């Protein structure tokens, strides 16, 4: 299989006057490239995929592709949807516009059965010839891709090469890699990046890397080299920021932190996302003091 | 406030050859009208709102309006979205095409904060002048509209008149009506229709009424007329079917039952929804035997 692994960033999507700030987006991606990130994920959960239009979602994938061109950095395009025809549409777009692979979140809200999830991802995988990474985040979607379903899709569909797990379930991560050690397990939960990598996970799709790409990149590559002491030290050091970045729903804290660090011009969301509480704003600002934040 | 209450049906959306069967859709609504239903909800969760296009969603609202025109039955159009600009668009469409009100599910997947939910619904309520019913279903959306937020919204926005509760939390239903008895609490969970009505809830938005509209209507009207013994009697009778209709994720069982009753032509869903397992198909068929299903 072709794979997309290593340190990866679930990119925030900046807004200026309620529109996607495309110049800021490219600058942010270029900051990720220059700080050791192996791949970028445009328009995931952290990129506010829900509130982008179909056209803006596609524009952000194109900016990612264009910015990473002539570099070693890959684009794992956000392409999930709770409608299979929508997810197939995004997968085919990402393939046709030069993405290296796609991320595809499990359908949210409509709670398909395991049989339905299998057919959903099978339809997506068959529509393209690039790698497909499953994405399990039951706290957001209301459904779970079971270990059996993941393993069946990995074994049955050529391009499905692993899963981004955001479920706080290290038992499942053991279950997945003990029964199917060939898949690429990707951490979707920054606080437990090191435990997942130390069990044979092969990368992270990180929120924190938006702010601290150098630290997440170093953690991941240390762990991949089995330098566990060094990877753990960074994971332990990052714990306070990893958790405060979820004091409110992601991406409210990370955009707050990026704004506080001067990396985006305005603290702007699309409704129903909005600014953090005044208190949580201050809690984020205080935790940030303990870290060295790279500029442009 | 202007309100829409009583016995209401979350209409299934039948498909034929992968498109909305607009003739069957109108026929099903007329079966609801003739069996005492007070309002119909086109394109809710049960109507597979996630997998309809913008156009199909709008077409279904129009058919409901047209079918209920010159009748006593109201249209409470499904208009929710996890993107506020989308929910405002659907709210304005529903107002402009003659719906009596809108249902608006809490944003799914992107998990807004309580402040974000307040602003989301304020934007929706201010966009139209027809009644707005909030819709809380945390098992599907991943977020909860808190009792405080509901109440604030009810008191601050003239068009917001209540909530459809689908959270299995009768304590919350006591909380809501003890602190704000003027709101219309609507049951969105068939198995506990009677407990919610007997505490002062004023209607149901039903899945089961698709199959047994006469029974759900009678249950609601007994309860509103304070015949709690007869409303409870029907609620008890319906428990087996109310429960089997969620053996798999709604609307997979209800469409299976509608197809088994000969009320829709094909057992067709849009992916990621799919046929129930063979075992659940037979279990649904078996439970149905105990009920008398009105035809057309
Ligand atoms: N709000 C819808 C549409 C998003 C379309 C672009 N990502 C959803 O979250 O699925
Ligand atoms: N699948 C998207 C778009 C649906 C648009 C029509 N209801 C969502 O669930 O939000
Ligand atoms: Mg090395």
UniProtKB/Swiss-Prot annotation, chains A, B:
CDD domains: DHDPS (cd00950)
Reactions the enzyme catalyzes: L-aspartate 4-semialdehyde + pyruvate = (2S,4S)-4-hydroxy-2,3,4,5-tetrahydrodipicolinate + H2O + H(+)
Binding site for pyruvate: 46, 205
Biochemical pathway: Amino-acid biosynthesis; L-lysine biosynthesis via DAP pathway; (S)-tetrahydrodipicolinate from L-aspartate: step 3/4
Active site, per annotation: 135, 164
GO biological process, one term: lysine biosynthetic process via diaminopimelate
Keywords for this protein: Amino-acid biosynthesis, Cytoplasm, Diaminopimelate biosynthesis, Lyase, Lysine biosynthesis, Schiff base
A single Gene Ontology CC term: cytosol
Subcellular localization, as worded in the UniProt entry: Cytoplasm
Assembly mode: Homotetramer; dimer of dimers.
Protein name, per record: 4-hydroxy-tetrahydrodipicolinate synthase
Organism of origin: Campylobacter jejuni subsp. jejuni serotype O:2 (strain ATCC 700819 / NCTC 11168)
């Amino acid at each position: 299989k072709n794979i997309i692994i290593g340190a990866m960033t679930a990119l925030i999507t900046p807004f200026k006057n309620g529109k996607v700030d495309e110049q800021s987006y490219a600058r942010l991606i270029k900051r990720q490239i220059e700080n050791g990130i192996d791949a970028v994920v445009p328009v995931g959960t952290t990129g506010e995929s829900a509130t982008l239009t179909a056209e803006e979602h596609r524009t952000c994938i194109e900016i990612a592709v264009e910015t990473c061109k002539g570099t070693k950095v890959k684009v794992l395009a956000g392409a999930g949807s709770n409608a299979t025809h929508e997810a197939v549409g995004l997968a085919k777009f990402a393939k046709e516009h030069g993405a290296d692979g796609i991320l595809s979140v499990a359908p949210y809200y409509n709670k398909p059965t395991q049989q339905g999830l299998y057919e959903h991802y099978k339809a997506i995988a068959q529509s393209v010839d690039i790698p497909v990474l499953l994405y399990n985040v039951p706290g957001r979607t209301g459904c779970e891709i079971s270990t059996d379903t993941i393993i069946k899709l990995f074994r049955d569909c050529e391009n499905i090469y692993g899963v981004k797990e955001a479920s706080g379930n290290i038992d499942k991560c053991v279950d997945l890699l003990a029964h199917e050690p060939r898949m690429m397990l990707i951490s979707g939960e920054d606080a437990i990046n090191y435990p997942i990598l130390s069990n044979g996970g092969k990368g992270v799709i990180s929120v924190t890397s938006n702010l601290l790409p150098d630290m997440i990149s170093a953690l991941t590559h240390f762990a991949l080299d089995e330098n566990y002491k060094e990877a753990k030290k960074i994971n332990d050091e990052l714990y306070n920021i990893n958790k405060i970045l979820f004091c409110e729903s992601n991406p409210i804290p990370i955009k707050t932190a990026m704004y506080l660090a001067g990396l985006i011009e305005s603290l702007e969301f699309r409704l129903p996302l909005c600014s953090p509480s005044k208190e949580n704003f201050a809690k984020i600002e205080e935790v940030m003091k303990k870290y060295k934040i790279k500029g442009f």
